[PDB]
Design a protein around this ligand. Sequence first.
Ligand SMILES: [K+]
Ligand SMILES: [K+]
Lengths: 17, 17
Amino acid sequence: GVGDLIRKAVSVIKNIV
Amino acid sequence: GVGDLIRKAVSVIKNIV
Ligand SMILES: [K+]
Ligand SMILES: [K+]
């Protein structure tokens, strides 16, 4: 769902650097 | 350079939802 999409997005952002 | 790509990626992520 959208909730998990945004949860995953935070994970991506935390690994992006 | 590379940093602008990472910054743009964060914007991209923020415009999915
Ligand atoms: K930028
Ligand atoms: K959005």
